[PDB]
Design a protein around this ligand. Structure first.
Ligand SMILES: Nc1nc2c(ncn2[C@@H]2O[C@H](COP(=O)(O)OP(=O)(O)OP(=O)(O)O)[C@@H](O)[C@H]2O)c(=O)[nH]1
Ligand SMILES: O=C([O-])C(=O)[O-]
Ligand SMILES: [Mn+2]
Ligand SMILES: [Mn+2]
Ligand SMILES: [Mn+2]
Length: 620
């Protein structure tokens, strides 16, 4: 079939067989092997022996260190320029711009970045030709969702970073059994490269191979392709997480009729024996992981964790909205995680966990800000910059966006239906962000349409998960601003259309704010385990208890409707204070934002809720 045997990469396969691969799978592997020119090709099988050889390889290349204090835990320190997502270098390629972002009325679109095919080709040809020279191309066959389940989606990631392969083994379900489940079916084509072909022209910081100047994460939904270059951080390199399960999945969900959302899933049980499932959409670094793994302070309540970041939801035949966690592990923020805030997280990360950019103690342990554990005398701390660190400096010992990567099956409170292919019925949906003033502790939407408007009007302070600085209050509708896969105006219409389905059991919609501050600059709510008190009120509202009070913004708890026993000193007057002067400015910013950003793709019912809220506020 060839004249010079120049396209047969069989002699370069150090594990696996190209003959064992399906037709379309082999075409994808050999095609990019010819483009990127790798030295070897490694077809992953997901085995324990393979994981052990990846760790030994990375340990011999100085990429990771062994944390001798714990059981099979490893530390990785990256280049300081490659620490988080780059929303400014994340682009979506479609034929028409309106398929990706609503055409703005004045400024530029904040709902995503669009790039034409012609411009992307020039960028692609300036990066990937010969980028894997001297490196190994790993072929990762992974599954998002329960393997063999009809709702699961299979992808193939090609990467030249064993750090990516190890993390993908934790965060997804990968191995040979996924290749057997695929057969001749469709799959998502994922291609990733660090952008440092050997020999190295640039010296690497902390042995972290990266090309920051040429970083680009592109999505082509019409071709089911994800192409990422330059970065190694999880949000940019683990292509099955944000790039696949959110951006690409959101467009597919619009086509097929389901939902891909940036939400946790938890089940909560009351002292009476009843259990309900909720989902909460908070922006990045705004409390999802701490809520899904919460240890309640109310006796008789139990919280079990289904997922903490991504949910795939769909109405079933009976009218129930059912949700599954497509992920296989947790990729959580490290700073702030202590025994008092998230004790269930501490139990989980003690084994088989890969840390990134946290500090290391001299006895082989981890350390970060807010760990709230004193160290024994003589224990020294090495910061994430691989330097000696003292508690009386300015640089923090761990990076503000440092992460841990741990398997979900090790969580002590993991829900016994987190791998069920049928999903869990969602009875409530929670929105919320970081609002230091004005927004009360909790309130409930008036209807399905008002609730969609509440999610569309979400605002929060900027966090360390992106490149935003200044703690400026930005819009983050549905906590999906960095992850929209298609036109946000059509996104809003897709949510509103669920109220038309026959026998639809629409969940209630709440809005919370754990981050309201007083005049002094400190928080008014302890949060963390005490958030169970707010969840108790939600549980009763779903059961139909008459414990709400009508306000111009929604239903708030009545007086003495929240269990505050054990606190008492809480200033309830400021936790639920509704200032007319605050909400008159808030509706103006929402009006100017929606008019400019959504423009002619704004559904009428969203405009009707904006008008109704403005009227209810003017009557105060
Ligand atoms: N004051 C207060 N802070 C909280 C609370 N819950 C979480 N936090 C802090 O918020 C930070 C973000 O917590 P996470 O739950 O890990 O962030 P996330 O929402 O999962 O963000 P992503 O994982 O990037 O999607 C943590 O470092 C916590 O210290 C809370 O209830 N009250
Ligand atoms: O890392 C994450 O999960 C994020 O950015 O939300
Ligand atoms: Mn997230
Ligand atoms: Mn999280
Ligand atoms: Mn309608």
């Amino acid at each position: 079939p060839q004249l010079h045997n120049g396209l047969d990469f069989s002699a370069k396969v150090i594990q696996g067989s190209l003959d064992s691969l399906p037709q379309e799978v082999r075409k994808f592997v050999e095609g990019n092997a010819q483009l990127c020119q790798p030295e070897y090709i490694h077809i992953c099988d997901g085995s324990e022996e393979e994981y052990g050889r990846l760790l030994a390889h990375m340990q011999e290349e100085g990429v990771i260190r062994k944390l001798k204090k714990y059981d099979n835990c490893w530390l990785a320190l990256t280049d300081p320029r490659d620490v988080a997502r780059i929303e400014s270098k994340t682009v979506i390629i479609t034929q028409e711009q309106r398929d990706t972002v609503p055409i703005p009325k004045s400024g530029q679109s904040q709902l995503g970045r669009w790039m034409s095919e012609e411009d992307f080709e020039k960028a692609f040809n300036a990066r990937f030709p010969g980028c894997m020279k001297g490196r190994t191309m790993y072929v990762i066959p992974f599954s998002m969702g329960p393997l063999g389940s009809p709702l699961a989606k299979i992808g193939i990631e090609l990467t030249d970073s064993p750090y990516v392969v190890a993390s993908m083994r934790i965060m997804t379900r990968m191995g040979t059994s996924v290749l057997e489940a695929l057969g001749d079916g469709e799959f998502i084509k994922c291609l990733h490269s660090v952008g440092c072909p050997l020999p190295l022209k640039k010296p690497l910081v902390n042995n972290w191979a990266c090309n920051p100047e040429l970083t680009l994460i592109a999505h082509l939904p019409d071709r089911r392709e994800i192409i990422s270059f330059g970065s190694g951080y999880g949000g940019n390199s683990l292509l099955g997480k944000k790039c696949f399960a959110l951006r690409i999945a959101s467009r597919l969900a619009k086509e097929e009729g389901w939902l891909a959302e940036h939400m946790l899933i938890l089940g909560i049980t009351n002292p009476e024996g009843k259990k309900k499932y909720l989902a909460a959409a908070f922006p990045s670094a705004c409390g999802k992981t701490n809520l899904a793994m919460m240890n309640p302070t109310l006796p008789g309540w139990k919280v079990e964790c289904v997922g903490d970041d991504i949910a795939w939801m769909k109405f079933d035949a009976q009218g129930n909205l059912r949700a599954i966690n497509p992920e296989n592990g947790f990729f959580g923020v490290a700073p702030g995680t202590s025994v008092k805030t998230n004790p269930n997280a501490i139990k989980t990360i003690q084994k088989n966990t890969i840390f990134t950019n946290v500090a290391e103690t001299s006895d082989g342990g981890v350390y970060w800000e807010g760990i709230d554990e004193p160290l024994a005398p003589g224990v020294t701390i090495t910061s994430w910059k691989n330097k000696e660190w003292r508690p009386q400096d300015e640089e923090p010992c761990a990076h503000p966006n440092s992460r841990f990567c741990t398997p979900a099956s090790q969580c002590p409170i993991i829900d016994p239906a987190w791998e069920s292919p049928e999903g869990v019925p969602i009875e409530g949906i929670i929105f919320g962000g970081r609002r230091p003033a004005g927004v009360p502790l909790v309130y409930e939407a008036l209807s399905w349409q008002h609730g969609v408007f509440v999610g569309a009007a979400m605002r929060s302070e900027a966090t360390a998960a992106a490149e935003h600085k200044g703690k400026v209050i930005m819009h983050d509708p549905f906590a999906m601003r960095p992850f929209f896969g298609y036109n946000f105006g059509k996104y809003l219409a897709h949510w509103l259309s669920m109220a038309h389905r026959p026998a639809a059991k629409l969940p209630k919609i709440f809005h919370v704010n754990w981050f309201r501050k007083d005049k002094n600059g400190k928080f008014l709510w302890p949060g963390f385990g005490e958030n169970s008190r707010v969840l108790e009120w939600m549980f009763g509202r779903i059961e139909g208890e008459d414990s709400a009070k009508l306000t111009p913004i929604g239903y708030v708890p009545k007086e003495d409707a929240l269990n505050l026993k054990g606190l008492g000193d809480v200033n309830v007057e400021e936790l639920f204070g509704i200032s007319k002067e605050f909400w008159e400015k808030e509706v103006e910013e929402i009006d100017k934002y929606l008019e400019d950003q959504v423009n002619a793709d704004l559904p009428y019912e969203i405009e009707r809720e904006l008008r109704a809220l403005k009227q209810r506020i003017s009557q105060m």
